[PDB]
Amino acid sequence: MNPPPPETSNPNKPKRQTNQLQYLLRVVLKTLWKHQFAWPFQQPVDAVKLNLPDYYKIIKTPMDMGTIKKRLENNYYWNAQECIQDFNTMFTNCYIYNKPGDDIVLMAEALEKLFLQKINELPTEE
Amino acid sequence: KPNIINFDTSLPTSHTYLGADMEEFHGRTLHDDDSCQVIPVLPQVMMILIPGQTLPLQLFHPQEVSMVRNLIQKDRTFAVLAYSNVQEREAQFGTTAEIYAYREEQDFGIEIVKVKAIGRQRFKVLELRTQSDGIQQAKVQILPECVLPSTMSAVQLESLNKCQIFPSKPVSREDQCSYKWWQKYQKRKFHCANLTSWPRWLYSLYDAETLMDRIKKQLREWDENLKDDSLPSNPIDFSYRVAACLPIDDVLRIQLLKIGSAIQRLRCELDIMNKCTSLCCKQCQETEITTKNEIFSLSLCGPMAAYVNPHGYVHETLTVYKACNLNLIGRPSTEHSWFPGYAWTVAQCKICASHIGWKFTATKKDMSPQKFWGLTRSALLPTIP
Amino acid sequence: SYNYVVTAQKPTAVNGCVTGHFTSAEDLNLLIAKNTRLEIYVVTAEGLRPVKEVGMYGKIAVMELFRPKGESKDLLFILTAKYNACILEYKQSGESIDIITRAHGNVQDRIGRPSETGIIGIIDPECRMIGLRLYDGLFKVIPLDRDNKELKAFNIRLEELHVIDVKFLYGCQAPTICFVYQDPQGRHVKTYEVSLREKEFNKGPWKQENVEAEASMVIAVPEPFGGAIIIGQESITYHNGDKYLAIAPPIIKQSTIVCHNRVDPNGSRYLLGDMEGRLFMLLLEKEEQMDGTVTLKDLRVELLGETSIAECLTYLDNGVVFVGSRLGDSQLVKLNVDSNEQGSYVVAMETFTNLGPIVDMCVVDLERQGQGQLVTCSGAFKEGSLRIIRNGKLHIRTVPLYESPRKICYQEVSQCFGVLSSRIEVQDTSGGTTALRPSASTQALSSSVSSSKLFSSSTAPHETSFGEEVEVHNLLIIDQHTFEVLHAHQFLQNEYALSLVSCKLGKDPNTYFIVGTAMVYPEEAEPKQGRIVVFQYSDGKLQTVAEKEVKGAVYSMVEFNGKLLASINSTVRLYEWTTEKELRTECNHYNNIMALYLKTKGDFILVGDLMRSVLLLAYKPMEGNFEEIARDFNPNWMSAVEILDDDNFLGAENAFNLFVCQKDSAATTDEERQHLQEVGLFHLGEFVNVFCHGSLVMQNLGETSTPTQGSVLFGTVNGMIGLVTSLSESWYNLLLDMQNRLNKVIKSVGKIEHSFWRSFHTERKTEPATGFIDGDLIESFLDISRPKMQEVVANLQYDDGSGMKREATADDLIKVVEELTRIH
Ligand SMILES: Cc1sc2c(c1C)[C@H](c1ccc(Cl)cc1)N[C@@H](CC(=O)NCCCCCCCCC(=O)N[C@@H](C)C(=O)N[C@H]1CCC(=O)NC1=O)c1nnc(C)n1-2
Ligand SMILES: [Zn+2]
């Protein structure tokens, strides 16, 4: 119940600032941020006020685009796959908790399609 | 009930949120009375369309988009089944809906169709067949709508025919202009009641104009700000408009749809209006939200109308000044706003945590309605003892 | 179901009357229209001599006399309610009299809504066309030539859609009309010029002017003066283009003038009649301007006296005036130069009986023989009375009441009648207790007043003003021998009496009068209070036994096997008469309609409303509750309903129609068994008010094996009384064939087809008649010649065996028709 998302700027873990990481920091992140739908997925879900006393039970790891942008700006990620996986779990931890057809679920799916078309053009290996 | 509304009550009629460059049509088609026709029915729709009422739609499934595209060319009309007899596809009556707006988008490679349609003639469901494509083409018989002459048109004396044209009604709505005028109107119109076995007030109880006047009186008593301008003058359109705005359950709406006479519909609406008390949460069944006195109209289509969410789901929203036992969840948003100029949070029953409706708060400081609520029809239970 | 409908009394009300030279060039005739009957008289010094009476297949709406150039006598133009038009001529060949149709046609529009001020028909003074106004926004013109034998007409569009009255003007070189219409700015008078070549309106001779807001009548003054006279609520005005004259006499302010007639051929004098029986004279004064031209100097009105409430007026000759009335008896009056002791210039000469309107009736046997008698509630206002009809022709005895009778019932033990009456009183000064004239309720032997206090805190807003009219309802006890009012009981203020019944309830050996009322207030629309009162009449004094206050209006009450069945608002309730002489509710049934009509036979209850919603209920004895058996909801206007048999029901519908519903209990599914099937349609032509079981013939003997079963009598607004009886299939088929072959030799006046006349008609749909046999057409079979009989009965087969009696001889059908004629 109410654990903070993965800590920003893991000091022990080494970091490389690659062009793929900068693409993630700007074109993916900002475009996802400025969306009419990405307004719930941008602050750590608060189940106490939204009053959903079980999410943290069904959800093992909580996270949001806010904390992931913070982790992207403060040196955290050694590579990109970590960040893509983190966003994928951010999608999954909603499809699994809510039921098919609902509204949050129908919103995310749109975000996930946007994300996929965005990241299929990630930079060549550098 | 502030003191004035400075909001253009003609704005929540065009549905600006849906789009702007709508492809409009003009051709109006009514087939006939008492014939049998086969017409497609849109799935996923759970509502009863009263004639004259508008219906916005957003469609995503390929079959619905394809059949709407085909229907645009042929006749531009489909069927909206009542679907109210239980919920297991039991249908007896329905309403014909005609499309007058159409546009298509591309989105993420998925075709999206936005359609605004209006209600039309009623029918009865005779036989229903299901097609492999998905469209449940059905055989229906168009119910006839009939007007009746005056009750005295048969017993009236010929010498008093020249006295059947009354002077213009006074415009200063007040005593000695309403009471006296209506008394003289009753005395002069039903003078030939002495030639029959029934009194004058009995015949006035079946007079269309008197019934419309009483309904207008009660509507203005609920909505003081509402003026006698938007309401139609024809009995049929007036009856349909009144029916399409009463916060009632589904059975009463079905029974009003079954009626084929304007006078009978007006009398039934008067009875229902005299009976309505308040509304309660559907799931909790006891939590009371708001009363009929708080119902007010921000649109020229009445206090109640149908809008479409950003995802395709259609909600019938009732505008009220205040709401109780509601908790708001989320941050005020100003996109796909149904009332241009306001923002919408999401409201949910404070007990069962079920969605009742939204709270629309004004952005500009100089707007007389600063906060008004919206309540979904299929989330409230009419609390009539 | 097969039914036979015949008339016993022809309609007596008068809706039109004209004068002229119809029968001969040197004879003065009076023509009177009575719904479907037309009567022709010759005016003599002694009085009126009947000459000819004919029947038409329709209700006469327009009747005018005109003389086209080249004719030696007037022609008659007639238009019926179904828009059948004709031109008729009178021919006398030796001693035989016939009426020839010189032109006929149906002037109807396939699309259009009927106008609000009714049907208007006018004729050009020079006989050049006929102007009709049937629908709003159109004016129909029929050229009057010798070749227009089909009465072909064309329509001219009118930009004014609220025409009140319209007339043709005298002295115009081209056909000119003058009319009054209403627009949002008020009422104006215009004028047009009708062109028969280009078929359109031209600019009129005068200029549009403003008139009084209550102007309703237009009178076309003859040639010497010219112009038109407009009569309003408080003023009379004369327009002649440039000349103008207006007077506002105070005499004509009390009541609205509704009819007029011209006395002098030059327009010097006119007769005016209002809605209260007053008769006025309007005089036109002439002056000469030493140029040979005569101009109108002034106008003046004078009160002549009082007559019956007039529908039409006609000055005959020598000061004799015919007064045609719909609510009372017609009259012949005499105008004297001098006045009597009361200043009245009118003197009654003759009176003609009128039974209409009939609002209630009952069948009794006063002489205790096998022959019944019919007692009806007739007339209205000061012309109301009681009429006793015997089958002795019919012998009618009149008992004037000077009130409006509403209900009537008979109590054999007390040897008296119970009548619900109503009189109009005006609110003068302190209180509204001023009576217009002495009435039966006021002039009674004994009297009593309701002293109930059940509703003392009732609404009663006291919104009363000076001169306001209030209705007072009374219960009158009338002796059955002398027909004198023995007792008059007055109900509470603002109380309306609706129903009356006489019956015995429970184990009580006494007979009671039971009345159901309703408290009515001007500001409320639907009553919320009511009362049921039990009266006992003994020793010559009326006494109240018990009273029960209900929460609605008691529209109907029926005795139900020793119990009282009452209709309160939209609820049917059953009561019991306990040993404490009270009423105790047993069961209630809640419907969705107002139970205006309540009939009972055995254990079945028929419930109906004003919108033709028929509901059938049954009583469950072991359970003590009601159940619904069948229903039939079809929107229309219904006037009355009756129970013919255990499964057949008869009702009167809108547009003067009759219908019969049937219940089929042999249906397989419960849905087919729960619906009523229409099995009879018929266009009667009259507005039925009341149905009742009974007969006027010596049915006590009853002979043996009557061809007809049952007997039902009904009374109409026009004073017509008819009879309905049931038939068998064989007789129905034979009579249908007889009607079909009879409508090929009878010459109808106006050449109207019988099937069109009897077709079930309404403004939505028209359907041919079914299940009804027209008894008048069958009875007309005896009045034709023997060769016509032989032609009619040619190749008809009937009867039991013997090769269907070969071909039916005319004598067989003669005997059959004579047997049928004995039922009334
Ligand atoms: C801060 C966070 S984090 C977060 C949510 C939040 C508020 C959410 C959550 C739920 C729903 C939304 Cl939409 C957003 C966020 N719920 C949780 C799960 C949860 O408690 N579910 C319970 C749903 C209760 C009723 C919800 C339907 C209401 C329909 C609705 O209002 N639909 C919109 C499109 C609509 O009708 N608009 C109208 C308004 C009038 C107008 O003018 N225009 C329109 O079209 C959630 N799941 N994962 C995450 C991330 N969250
Ligand atoms: Zn709840």
Residue-by-residue DSSP string for B175-208 = TTTSHHHHHHHHHHHTGGGGGSSS-HHHHHTT-H
Distance B346 CA to ligand 1 centre (A): 7
Helices (H) and strands (E) in chain B, counts: 7, 15
What is the residue whose two structure tokens read 């009759």? C658
| B329 with A40: Cβ contact below 8 A | no
Cβ of C164 within 8 Å of Cβ of B162? The answer is yes
Most C-contacting residue of B195, B211, B264, B268 (CB-CB within 10 A), to test interface: B195
Please give the distance, rounded to the nearest whole angstrom, from the Cα atom of residue B365 to the centre of ligand 1: 27
> What is the least distance, in Å, from the CA of B297 to any CA of chain C?
27
Closest CA to C352 of C791, C797, C815, C11: C11
Cβ–ligand 1 contact at A103 (below 6 Å) = yes
Which residue lies with its CA nearest to atom 12 of ligand 1?
A104
Question: Are C176 and C205 contacting, i.e. CB atoms less than 8 angstroms apart?
Answer: yes
Q: Label residue C438 left, alpha or beta by phi (over 0 means left) and psi (-120 to 50 means alpha).
A: beta
- CATH fold of C732-821 reads DNA polymerase; domain 1 (1.10.150)
- Smallest CA-to-CA distance from B124 within B139, B105, B108 is with B139
Decide: C60 and C33 in contact? Cβ < 8 Å: yes
Query: What is the Cα–Cα distance from C527 to A73, expressed in whole angstroms?
Result: 79
Q: CB of B195 within 8 Å of any CB in chain C?
A: yes
Among B15, B18, B298, B309, say which to mutate for ligand 1: greatest number of ligand atoms within 8 Å of CB: B309
Asked if C123 contacts C112 with a C-beta cutoff of 8 angstroms, the reply is no
What distance in Å separates the CA atoms of residue C564 and residue C554, rounded to the nearest whole number? 12
Two tokens, residue C555: 């529209």
3-state secondary structure of A25: helix
Instruction: Give C18's contacts (C-beta < 8 A, 6+ positions apart).
Output: C30, C31, C63, C64, C65, C314
Q: Name, in order, each residue with C-beta under 8 angstroms of B350's C-beta and a sequence gap of 6 or more.
A: B287, B325, B326, B327
Residues of chain C within CATH 2.130.10.10 domain(s) are 3-352, 358-731
Q: Does the Cβ of B346 fall within 6 Å of ligand 1?
A: yes
Return d(Cα C273, Cα C260) in angstroms, integer.
6
- Nearest CB partner across the interface for C525, out of B157, B198, B214: B214
**Which two three-digit tokens encode residue B231?**
């309401």
For domain A18-122, the CATH class is mainly alpha
Tokens for C50, please give them: 């009947």
Phi, psi of C722 (to 5 degrees): -125, 175
Cβ(B335) – ligand 1 distance below 6 Å: no
Is the separation of the CB atoms in A22 and A77 below 8 Å? no
Count of positions (residues) in chain C: 824
C-alpha distance from B265 to closest chain C C-alpha (Å):
12
DSSP string across C186-202: EEEEEEEEEETTTTEEE
Experimental method: cryo-EM
Closest to C494 in 3D by CA, of C411, C432, C402:
C432
Resolution in A: 2.5
Which among B160, B74, B59 is positioned nearest to B112, based on CA atoms?
B59
The closest alpha carbon to B44, from B134, B145, B147, belongs to: B134
Distance from CA of A10 to the nearest CA of B (A): 31
Residues C111 and C275: their CA atoms lie apart, in Å, by 35
Task: Name the strand (E) or helix (H) holding C731.
Answer: helix C729-742
First to last CA, chain B: 27
Q: How many helices (H) does chain A have, and how many strands (E)?
A: 6, 0
Kindly report, as residue ranges, where domains of CATH 1.10.150.910 are found in chain C: 732-821
Q: Cα Rg for chain B, rounded, in angstroms?
A: 23
CA of C618 to nearest chain B CA: how many angstroms apart? 25
- By the 8 A CB rule, do B296 and B318 touch? no
Lookup result for tokens 């605004």 = B116
Q: Do chains C and B touch (3 or more CB pairs under 8 A)?
A: yes
| H or E stretch at B264 | helix B262-275
Residue B352 in contact with partner chain A when CB distance is under 8 A: no
Residue B320: φ, ψ to 5°: -130, 155
The verdict on whether omega for the bond into residue C114 sits within 30 degrees of 0, i.e. cis, is no
Contact B352, B281 (CB under 8 A): yes
CATH topology of domain C358-731: Methylamine Dehydrogenase; Chain H (2.130.10)
CATH superfamily for domain C3-352: YVTN repeat-like/Quinoprotein amine dehydrogenase (2.130.10.10)
Give me the residue spans of the domains in chain A. 18-122
Q: With H, G, I as helix, E, B as strand and everything else as coil, classify residue B235.
A: helix
Find the ligand nearest to A53 CA.
Answer: 1
CA distance readout (Å), C416 to B52, C409, C410: 60, 9, 6
**How large is the angle between the packed helices B250-258 and B262-275, nearest 10 degrees?**
160
Q: Which residues make beta-bridge pairs with B26?
A: none
CA B262, CA C777: separation in Å to the nearest integer?
40
Closest residue to A113, CB basis, from B108, B329, B335:
B108
For residue B44, is it left (φ>0), alpha (ψ between -120 and 50) or beta?
left
What is the three-class DSSP state of B59? strand
Chains that touch B (3 or more CB pairs under 8 A): A, C
Contact B330 A106 (CB under 8 A): no
- How close B238 comes to chain C (CA, Å)? 19
Cβ(C415)–Cβ(C479) below 8 Å: yes
Contact B154 C656 (CB under 8 A): yes
Cβ-Cβ contacts under 8 Å for C626 (sequence gap 6 or more): C572, C587, C589, C605, C617, C618, C619, C620
Residues 317-346 of B with CB under 8 A from A: 329-331, 333, 335-336
Structure tokens at B371: 């906060």
Integer CA distances (angstroms), C192 to C53, C175, C177, C204, C243, in order = 39, 9, 5, 4, 18
Task: Tell me how far the alpha carbon of residue B285 lies from the centroid of ligand 1, in angstroms.
Answer: 23
Residue type, C536: Q
**Residues of A with CB below 8 A from B60's CB?**
none
Atom of ligand 1 nearest to the CA of B315: 36
Q: What angle do CA C711, C714, C720 make, to 5 degrees?
A: 125
Helix extents (H) in C350-447:
none
Closest atom of ligand 1 relative to the B317 alpha carbon: 40
Q: Please state, in angstroms and rounded to a whole number, the distance separating the CA atoms of residues C399 and B284.
A: 71
Domains in chain B: ranges and CATH: 36-142 (2.30.130.40), 208-276 (1.20.58.1480), 280-382 (2.170.150.20)
Q: Mutating which of A35, A48, A106, A111 best tests the B interface, going by the most B Cβ atoms within 10 A?
A: A106
Residue B366 sits at the chain A interface (C-beta within 8 Å):
no
Question: Most distant CA pair in chain B: distance in Å?
Answer: 75
User: How many angstroms separate the CA atoms of B87 and B91, rounded?
Assistant: 9
Angle at C761 between CA C755 and CA C767, to 5 degrees: 65
Helices marked H in C703-809: 729-742, 754-758, 775-779, 786-792, 802-805
Q: What is the DSSP string of C121-142?
A: EEE-TTSSEEEEE-BTTEEEEE
CA dihedral of B292, B298, B301, B307, whole degrees rounded to 10: -90
Ligand 1, atom 36, residue with closest C-alpha = B309
> Chain A closest CA to B311's CA: distance in Å?
8
- Ligand 1 pocket, B336 CB below 6 A? yes
Nearest CB neighbour to A106, from listed B311, B335, B353: B311
Phi, psi for residue C281 in degrees, rounded to 5 = -125, 125
List the residue whose alpha carbon is closest to atom 8 of ligand 1: A104
Ligand 1 touching residue B328 (CB < 6 A): no
Which chains have at least 3 CB atom pairs separated by less than 8 Å from chain C? B
| C649 token code pair | 């029901």
Q: Which two tokens stand for residue C531?
A: 């009362």
CB-based contact, B351 to chain A, within 8 Å: no
Substitution target in C609, C637, C639 with the highest count of B β-carbons within 10 Å is C637
- Whether C216 sits inside 8 A of B197 (CB atoms) is no
Query: Whose structure tokens read 């030639």?
Result: B195
Site from B106, B311, B333, B349 to mutate, A interface, most A CB atoms within 10 angstroms: B311
Q: What is the B286 CA–ligand 2 centroid distance (Å)? A: 8
CA atoms of C264 and B346, how far apart (whole Å): 86
Look at the block and give the residue holding tokens 């519909």.
B265
Q: Which residues contact C422 (CB under 8 A, 6 or more apart)?
A: C403, C404, C406, C471, C472, C473, C474
Structure-token pair, residue C737? 């064939």
